[PDB]
Design a protein around this ligand. Structure first.
Ligand code: 8G9
Ligand code: 8G9
Lengths: 306, 306
């Protein structure tokens, strides 16, 4: 038992991190087969990044401008191209540690692991979620760009995030592995509005089920409610609406506990209107929304990978 | 910026995890050089587990009773021996993936990363603390025994924890790698209870510094206090005493923010007496005590490992 913010094992990804240097800009790259992926603003200078013209900047570049470092091995660059906001550097050596992988673009609400890196080397691994305003609440310092987010399904790494920039509210923005930003953000140092964030209601319900599975079952009550009357209190409390699809995804969790989905909604309703009265759920004094229904099931049934 | 529960990258440890099977019992083992380390209750039958004398089952075992899979490859066992509560199975093959390592015994308050495993396969990685009562608040299902906890300095894995058992409050107990339990627990199904937990004061203060370093600022005040005045408040609220050694360890953080340790104590003091009143610190509604001052510095300074 017990319930923790759990990240996927990071080995398969560590073997792909390299360091990319152009001018006096160092950041991290992702080396898969004979291609190194990194954010395109590695080619900018401190004077450039007020409003650069990226394909101007890239045409002025040669392969030899890009210093690509894998441990101590230097990696020869033999071609380059720009796909939206990521740079793709063709190198003369296929990464022998290339895992089975996919590139996927994830929806808001879904979670992934982040392997924070600096100068090609991993610093740490943590879990988080793609907020409904398409930001992530990460932990990223200077030089962390190029760090990636990922899920693991048995043997195969699905990369979903590359890190690009910090917004002034302390949150983070980046792209998928095809260079397309999540949200309305751009890799230019002009004024950008993060947008107001809502709580991921389906995830909060999932964590409430994790709480029941782990013995926390105060906050449960008599009541039931309709999706309309629940959705109508979630509106007040800045929660995103609950759909029938959400109801269905929580089915397995609902069946394993004997608490129907609309009953757990009546608990959430009552928790929102009254607060927690000095109590904690799974060691938290707030309602947590960064566990999906899948995160709950895999952690409370012990699903593994290889 | 930003601040999350960050675990060490788990690559070096994944390549050491194996499966150990004896009788009907399966758990995980740690394979370094030609030795596999696992909990000794793998030799128990489901009826022995009431009060086994472990030198029993061991002298009654033969080498071929131990089935050890490293992936599909079966490792032949050519010797065995017991060191306190762990078995050491000598196998005929040195692990080619053996990282540089040490075995260390941590103190309460210190944190480490856990790579939870099932049937030799890594399932997830998270961070946590050795509680003052020598429990850890983990996430462990059946088959997780033999999973290890660890730290990393530059390039060296310091294993500090092997998992053995769950206590009835939902918390977990285990050994160091040299066989000795943390706390007064034994690997028998006899009645045992954790003992009353306290809060790691020095860690709460470190986390407050992380909050300041990240712009959470609302909890500061004019006041200062003495260590003796503060420790009388810590005692009422079930907090560990603060020593002058703790004050010194908090120096770096104190110097980076310009807030004296005894100033941060005076504002922890008022947080304890007024509570938090709505608001949060680093996304939490509780005072967090599972970050050490080393954890705060490395995450805020971006220390990496190789
Ligand atoms: C790449 O390693 C860094 C990682 C940053 C640095 C600290 N935290 C991070 O996530 N990214 C950047 O330096 C990007 C890069 C240039 C500016 N930038 C930022 O993150 C800046 N933020 C903004 O300028 N944000 C707005 C919304 C555009 C105003 C920052 C935080 C000032 C360095 C560019 C965006 C190309
Ligand atoms: C080894 O894989 C498991 C891991 C446990 C099982 C679920 N979560 C865990 O942490 N460890 C055990 O099976 C140990 C082992 C036998 C019993 N045991 C337990 O953890 C049991 N707990 C207790 O017996 N606790 C008291 C306090 C001694 C009564 C449990 C959780 C009921 C299966 C032995 C201790 C040898």
């Amino acid at each position: 038992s017990g319930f923790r913010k759990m990240a996927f094992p990071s080995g398969k990804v560590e073997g792909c991190m390299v360091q990319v240097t152009c001018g006096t800009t160092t950041l991290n790259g992702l080396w898969l087969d004979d291609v190194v992926y990194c954010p395109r603003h590695v080619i900018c200078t401190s004077e450039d990044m007020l409003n650069p013209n990226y394909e101007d900047l890239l045409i002025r570049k040669s392969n030899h401008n890009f210093l690509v470092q894998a441990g101590n091995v230097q990696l020869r660059v033999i071609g380059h191209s720009m796909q939206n906001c990521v740079l793709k550097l063709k190198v003369d050596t296929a990464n022998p540690k290339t895992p089975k992988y996919k590139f996927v673009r994830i929806q808001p609400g879904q979670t992934f692991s982040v392997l924070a890196c600096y100068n090609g080397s991993p610093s740490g691994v943590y879990q988080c979620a793609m907020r409904p305003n398409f930001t992530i609440k990460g932990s990223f310092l200077n030089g962390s760009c190029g760090s990636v987010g990922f899920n693991i399904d048995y043997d195969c790494v699905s990369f979903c995030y590359m890190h690009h920039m910090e917004l002034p509210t302390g949150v983070h923005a980046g792209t998928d592995l095809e260079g397309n930003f999540y949200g309305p953000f751009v890799d230019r140092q002009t004024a950008q509005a993060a947008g107001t964030d809502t709580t991921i209601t389906v995830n909060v319900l999932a964590w409430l089920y994790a709480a029941v599975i782990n013995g926390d079952r105060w906050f449960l009550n008599r009541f039931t409610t309709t999706l309309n009357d629940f959705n109508l209190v979630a509106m007040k409390y800045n929660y995103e609406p609950l759909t029938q699809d959400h109801v269905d995804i929580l089915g397995p969790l609902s069946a394993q506990t004997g608490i129907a989905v609309l009953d757990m909604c009546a608990s959430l309703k009552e928790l929102l209107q009254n607060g927690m009265n000095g109590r904690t759920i799974l060691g938290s004094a707030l309602l947590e929304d960064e566990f999906t229904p899948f995160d709950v099931v895999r952690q409370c049934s012990g699903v593994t990978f290889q």
